[PDB]
Design a protein around this ligand. Structure first.
Ligand SMILES: CC(=O)O[C@H]1C(=O)[C@@]2(C)[C@H]([C@H](OC(=O)c3ccccc3)[C@]3(O)C[C@H](OC(=O)[C@H](O)[C@@H](NC(=O)c4ccccc4)c4ccccc4)C(C)=C1C3(C)C)[C@]1(OC(C)=O)CO[C@@H]1C[C@@H]2O
Ligand SMILES: Nc1nc2c(ncn2[C@@H]2O[C@H](COP(=O)(O)OP(=O)(O)OP(=O)(O)O)[C@@H](O)[C@H]2O)c(=O)[nH]1
Ligand SMILES: Nc1nc2c(ncn2[C@@H]2O[C@H](COP(=O)(O)OP(=O)(O)O)[C@@H](O)[C@H]2O)c(=O)[nH]1
Ligand SMILES: Nc1ncnc2c1ncn2[C@@H]1O[C@H](COP(=O)(O)OP(=O)(O)O)[C@@H](O)[C@H]1O
Ligand SMILES: [Mg+2]
Ligand SMILES: [Mg+2]
Lengths: 434, 367, 441
């Protein structure tokens, strides 16, 4: 019943989500026709979270594919799982946003957005009880940053009592892939802070290190990277589809992860990832998984938690785990690494355990963490931003589409206030005597 | 160099129809400056000191503070400083059915602070209206309702639903402000009264269990006063201007859903009020700890109210608080929360300055 | 669905079009007859790639291009050569008399009574296009038609179509080599008019490609059938994301944005790193880390201007073939580490990246090799100010004595148009100083 609408904006999200349905269908026993060819009877019990029944027990996903270019949509159709999506749910235009946040928000996206709302309002009304939404976009361009942030501004107005989860690829620290990353990443944060409840921040430079350092992959394509993001996307929504001993919805995590309404930027993770050789030399058990999850070298956010403090974290387990083995291990982290946690939250950790594991692993785990080390990502954009905006380098492509310099200054001070909201907590606090 | 302290004042209300039907006991006693609360259980007694106390419990007992008395004790100094060239703020705080709207706006035959303020302002202007000094006055009156902003001084068009919301923005110097807001000119008391009537008729009101005319929205009354003056200079005169913003704020109540029998829009709007008071409270708790050496970050962006009032709670204004309390024993903990937040607001210090409209230009370097 | 119009002005543009339309046909499976036999094996789809080639119901493919030269020689080669059965017979010759290398003839006098017959064909093509994304203009500073006509055209195209990307591929005059005594004027008069209307002007210089073809491909006696085949590749890279699949696709409005901070210094430089022959094709790895570093090797630039005398304001890398992003990020990280490649203080994110999957094709009779990887760089540098100053000094040496001006006045050009265009070119030389001065608080 806890139904979810998936929305995929840009060459990134439509490339991630396309793998997300290659990963969920294998978990629910759906073939590329929509026909069910599974083994267990638990798959079909809660397949309604992501899928809809069409005619003959053919299952059509609740996906929404949006972009300002038809090239990405052709890859989905001419692909493995192209024939299952609703062909009336592919919304597209031409003459894309040109790496301009001004176009996807005001000029071009505003022409195509009402078409997107037609799909959303039809899929949500067709759902019995909406748990929330799920957006996969890339801020750094103009479509996912512009046309995605605009949709959240509108769904939050129509559905203000529902969850709006977001899986966003953030700009990377070392090497750029778009020259105007700061202007587009900045203005998105000015909107996401006001209109989101969970925002999972992903960075490709970290996945390049995961794929190289852990998986021992020498030529990692974007398929492999998005084969990692889709995992966490499945772990967060596992306790709605399969049963367990301690279940956790989306709201139970945010209530246990968002202590103040603006600090909803997380550092995800997945366990157990290994190379194809070392698999025969490991022992799959919780103390082996918890060591990978809390490892700084297994994050996707390109931020070291050891330069901050975990305000609150979570752990979603899948398998025939032992709860004593789980509760004992999370306590070992806080008592050992007490400096990387806050004092005014006594138990900084939440846990959840499902009983039905991933297709080929006797046990998996998904990790979500809110830390003050996300300060480093926002503090960087604020430096690149003001360095360009102080000289007004590329600004005439944003004003020429119907924007003003004041809207560039608002987003700067907001992001700078979010830095201070995280920075007060990162410094160790002390009462008079306590 | 200036550090202006916030002027906190308290007003005890008389018993209500509910608190007389249920024959509730008196627990808030006064002696003048101090206000004490003897719990019924008689296990401990709390007492608080304030700059100003008002006791409207009895219309006969000595110490009875009236509308004119609260005015002449609180607002008249703010008017003096506003003419001096300061920005000023007067904001109410309390629970449901405690005398905030009656205190500030008042009724037809029992005026509050706002009409008296505007009247004495125009009187002093007409009495000092020389060719040496000219005066220009703009007003605005707006509303916060379910985190949405609304203009009160418009004649809405006919429709199934006609409430066009506005947006809040951040000007780098002037600070937060509202885009799309009617700033209407005023020459005398009559236009002010007409606009006040229109605004109080457009404001959101409802019937709940603790007040039949419960305001479902925060209300801000802004007056922008620009006084122009001369100095004999190399050329023409009329080369000094002093601007002053007066912000009179009437907020709603905490509204426990159990007592305030609420379902649907009342719950919804009530919940919004509860989220607005929690944020405001957190901002008054951080401003009272930032005036004691400890460094803290005030969260003004978590609520449109505190966001617009960034310049009043802190920053540049001479500001005053009117806490409103009920003397019954069935509301002790809420009265005490009000009094504790007021005693913490007493410790706030702002940096008030004269708006000469000349800094960095020429006479800053003269100085 | 995404369609781009090409405009080839002068002998230069036509001789690059012919180089271009020999390559666009091979990649997509088209013969010079306009036909497409490999549709037997797929059954339609979009292999008749609508970016360049429209299609008739009879199976014929006709390209979206407009040629114009004001001289019948170069275009009559097309109506009598291999590609006579491909092009629409409306190939705009009005060459009863050429422009005599005179921007006053190409703009006014002989530029009219042919500038109104060029807009009709474009307007005819656009009404066949649904998603028109922009124009691609091939011309040359140094002539009258490639200097006057283009200016005259780009003014009109900035009114009929307005806000659409107009990217130029123009041959910039070389510092030493030249084929005319009036390149300074026409190159200076054309910027002044084309500056406020174009969006990104890709420059090339034949003195550079001559050196590339000598050092790399081992061609010591080349001609223009070789140079124009390299330029054919640069355009295929820019337009590849509109035809084939990929991971990071780049629309036309991304070059207009990342490479052009201010609206007046939109003058980038181009490169093509793996310019190697079939023999040097072996003995070499040809990886991303190999190909990316060559694009900053100043000897492999396609315009003679050392970036080590200036600073980079932006850079766009366009990869093709078997390329993995992990190899790209490792490469840009190596360039950001080096100190001989300076970037402005107001662009710490100074790299745009795009990737495609379709490798380049090999024209038979060609000089280039078969490769699985290929890269095109597009860099906006402050070095280009040196070339403007050179053209400005030549202008002053020859305008102070009023040489060759009577040929321009004789074609309706005012004397004050040379002082107004040389004073507007002396502003841009100052703009490139400001963008190179490091900010201070
Ligand atoms: C033991 C064995 O025979 O091979 C393993 C294997 O080598 C490992 C390393 C697999 C392997 O994963 C990868 O090789 C990989 C490549 C790029 C990026 C990420 C992973 C495996 O492919 C993955 C596969 O696991 C799954 O298939 C999960 O069900 C996975 N399924 C998919 O994602 C999927 C993708 C495309 C099509 C169908 C299914 C999954 C992950 C998260 C949530 C649900 C399902 C397994 C056990 C293995 C192989 C096959 C080698 C791992 O898979 C994951 C992410 O759980 C990688 O680390 C685990 C540990 C496994 O032991
Ligand atoms: N790269 C390249 N440049 C060429 C080619 N043909 C001519 N040019 C250049 O064109 C420049 C002068 O322009 P023209 O050749 O006269 O061409 P045009 O635009 O028609 O000028 P007009 O004949 O006067 O109308 C010379 O400096 C050449 O370098 C060519 O095939 N390839
Ligand atoms: N992880 C991942 N990121 C991608 C992928 N493709 C693009 N991106 C990111 O998305 C950004 C490009 O923005 P994009 O949405 O494609 O621009 P648009 O085409 O104009 O909408 C870059 O910063 C990339 O880092 C992908 O396949 N995987
Ligand atoms: N000092 C007073 N004298 C007489 N009546 C009062 C006094 N204070 C409050 N009241 C009565 O109590 C009610 C106050 O409601 P109000 O102040 O509007 O609630 P809130 O302060 O929550 O907006 C009014 O109906 C008013 O008649
Ligand atoms: Mg009220
Ligand atoms: Mg010619």
């Amino acid at each position: 019943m806890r139904e979810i609408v998936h929305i995929q904006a840009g060459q990134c999200g439509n490339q991630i989500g396309a793998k997300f349905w290659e990963v969920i269908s294998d978990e629910h026993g759906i073939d590329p026709t929509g026909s069910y060819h599974g083994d267990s009877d638990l798959q079909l019990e809660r397949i309604n979270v992501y899928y809809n029944e069409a005619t003959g027990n053919k299952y059509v996903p609740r996906a929404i594919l949006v972009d300002l270019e038809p090239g990405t949509m052709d890859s989905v159709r001419s692909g493995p799982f192209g024939q299952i999506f609703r062909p009336d749910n592919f919304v597209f235009g031409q003459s894309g946003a040109g790496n301009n946040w001004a176009k996807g928000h005001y000029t071009e996206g505003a022409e195509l957005v009402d078409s997107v709302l037609d799909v959303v309002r039809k899929e949500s009304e067709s759902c019995d009880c909406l748990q929330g939404f799920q957006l996969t976009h890339s801020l750094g361009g103009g479509t996912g940053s512009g046309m995605g942030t605009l949709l959240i501004s509108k769904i939050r107005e129509e559905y203000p009592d529902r969850i709006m989860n977001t899986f966003s690829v953030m700009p990377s620290p070392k090497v750029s892939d778009t020259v105007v990353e700061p202007y587009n990443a900045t203005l998105s944060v000015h909107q996401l802070v006001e209109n989101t409840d969970e925002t999972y921040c992903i960075d490709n430079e970290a996945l390049y290190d995961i794929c190289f350092r852990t998986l021992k992959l020498t030529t990692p394509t974007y398929g492999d990277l998005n084969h990692l993001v889709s995992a966490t996307m499945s772990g967060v929504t596992t306790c709605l589809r399969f049963p367990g001993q301690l279940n956790a919805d989306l709201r139970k995590l945010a209530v246990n992860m968002v202590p103040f309404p603006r600090l909803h930027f997380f550092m995800p993770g997945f366990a157990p990832l290994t190379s194809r050789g070392s698999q025969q030399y490991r022992a799959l058990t919780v103390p082996e998984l918890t060591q990978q999850m809390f490892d700084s070298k297994n994050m996707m956010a390109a931020c070291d938690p050891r330069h901050g403090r975990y305000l609150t974290v979570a752990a979603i387990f899948r398998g025939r785990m032992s709860m004593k083995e789980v509760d004992e291990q999370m306590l070992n982290v806080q008592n050992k690494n007490s400096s990387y946690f806050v004092e005014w939250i006594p138990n900084n950790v939440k846990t959840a355990v499902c009983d039905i594991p991933p297709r080929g692993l006797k046990m998996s785990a998904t990790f979500i963490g809110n830390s003050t080390a996300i300060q480093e990502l926002f503090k960087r954009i604020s430096e690149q931003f003001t360095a360009m905006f102080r000289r007004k380098a590329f600004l005439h492509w944003y004003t020429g589409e119907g924007m003003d310099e004041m809207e560039f200054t608002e987003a700067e001070s907001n992001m700078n206030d979010l830095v201070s909201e995280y920075q007060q907590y990162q410094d160790a606090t002390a009462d008079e005597q306590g | 160099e200036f550090n202006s302290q916030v002027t906190v004042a308290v007003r005890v209300r008389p018993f209500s129809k509910r608190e007389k039907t249920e024959k509730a006991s008196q627990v808030v006693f006064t002696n003048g400056e101090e206000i004490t609360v003897e719990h019924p259980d008689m296990k401990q007694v709390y007492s608080f000191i304030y700059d100003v106390s008002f006791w409207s419990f009895d219309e006969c007992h000595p110490g009875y503070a009236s509308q004119t008395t609260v005015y002449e004790t609180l607002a008249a100094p703010l008017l003096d400083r506003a003419f001096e060239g300061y920005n000023t703020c007067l904001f109410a705080y309390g629970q449901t059915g405690s005398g905030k709207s009656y205190t500030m706006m008042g009724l037809n035959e029992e005026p509050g602070i706002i009409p008296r303020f505007c009247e004495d302002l125009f009187a002093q202007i007409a009495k000092k209206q020389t060719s040496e000094v000219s005066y220009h006055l703009e007003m605005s009156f707006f509303e916060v309702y379910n985190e949405k902003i609304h203009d009160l001084l418009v004649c809405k068009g006919e429709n199934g639903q006609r409430k066009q919301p506005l947006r809040a923005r951040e000007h780098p110097v002037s600070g937060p402000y509202v885009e799309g807001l009617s700033m209407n000119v005023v020459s005398s008391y009559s236009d002010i009264q007409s606009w006040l009537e229109l605004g109080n008729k457009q404001r959101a009101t409802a019937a709940t269990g603790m007040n039949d005319k419960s305001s479902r929205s925060h209300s801000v009354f802004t007056l922008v006063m620009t006084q122009t003056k001369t100095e004999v200079v190399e050329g023409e005169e009329h080369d000094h201007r002093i601007t002053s913003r007066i912000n009179l704020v009437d907020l709603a109540g905490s509204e426990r859903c159990s007592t305030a029998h609420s379902s649907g829009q009342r719950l919804k709007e009530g919940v919004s009020i509860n989220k607005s008071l929690l944020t405001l409270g957190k901002v008054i708790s951080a401003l009272s700890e930032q005036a004691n050496g400890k460094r803290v970050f005030i969260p003004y962006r978590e609520s449109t109210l505190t966001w617009l009032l960034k310049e009043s709670l802190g920053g540049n204004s001479k500001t005053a608080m009117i806490a409103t309390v009920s003397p019954a024993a069935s509301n002790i903990e809420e009265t005490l929360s009000t009094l504790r937040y007021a005693t913490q607001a007493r410790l706030i210090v702002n940096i008030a300055k004269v708006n000469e409209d000349m800094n960095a230009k020429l006479i800053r370097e003269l100085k | 669905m995404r369609e781009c119009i090409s405009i080839h002005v002068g002998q230069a543009g036509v001789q690059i079009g012919n180089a271009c339309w020999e390559l666009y046909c091979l990649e997509h499976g088209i013969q010079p007859d306009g036909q497409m036999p490999s549709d037997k094996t797929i059954g339609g789809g979009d292999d008749s790639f609508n970016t360049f080639f429209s299609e008739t119901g009879a199976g014929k493919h006709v390209p979206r291009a407009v040629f114009v030269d004001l001289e019948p020689t170069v275009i009559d080669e097309v109506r009598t050569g291999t590609y006579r059965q491909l092009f629409h017979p409306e190939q705009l010759i009005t060459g009863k008399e050429d422009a005599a290398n005179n921007y006053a003839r190409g703009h006014y006098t002989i530029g009219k009574e042919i500038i109104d017959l060029v807009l009709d064909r474009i307007r005819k093509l656009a009404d066949q296009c649904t998603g028109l994304q922009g124009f691609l203009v091939f011309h040359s500073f140094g002539g009258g038609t490639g200097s006057g006509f283009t200016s005259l055209l780009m003014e009109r195209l900035s009114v009929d179509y307005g806000k659409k990307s107009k990217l130029e591929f123009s041959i910039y005059p070389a510092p030493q080599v030249s084929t005319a005594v009036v390149e300074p004027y026409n190159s200076i008069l054309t910027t002044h008019t084309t500056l406020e209307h174009s969006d990104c002007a890709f420059m090339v210089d034949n003195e550079a490609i001559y050196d590339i073809c000598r050092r790399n491909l081992d061609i010591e006696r080349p001609t223009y059938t070789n140079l124009n085949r390299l330029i054919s590749q640069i355009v295929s890279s820019i337009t590849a994301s509109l035809r084939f699949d990929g991971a990071l696709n780049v629309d036309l409005t991304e070059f207009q944005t990342n490479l052009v901070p201010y609206p007046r210094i939109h003058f980038p430089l181009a490169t093509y790193a793996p310019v190697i022959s079939a023999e040097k094709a072996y003995h070499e790895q040809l990886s991303v880390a190999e190909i990316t570093n060559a694009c900053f090797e100043p000897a492999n630039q396609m315009v003679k201007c050392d970036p080590r005398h200036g600073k980079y304001m932006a850079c766009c890398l366009l990869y093709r073939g078997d390329v993995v992003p992990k190899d790209v990020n490792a490469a840009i990280a190596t360039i950001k580490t080096k100190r001989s490649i300076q970037f402005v203080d107001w662009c710490p994110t100074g790299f745009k990246v795009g990737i495609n999957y379709q490798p380049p094709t090999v024209v038979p009779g060609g000089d280039l090799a078969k490769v699985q990887r290929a890269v095109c760089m597009l860099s906006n540098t402050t070095a280009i100010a040196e070339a403007w100053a050179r053209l400005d000094h030549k202008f002053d040496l020859m305008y102070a004595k009023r040489a060759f001006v009577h040929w321009y006045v004789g074609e309706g050009m005012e004397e004050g148009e040379f002082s107004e265009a040389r004073e507007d070119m002396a502003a841009l030389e100052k703009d490139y100083e400001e963008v190179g001065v490091d900010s201070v608080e």
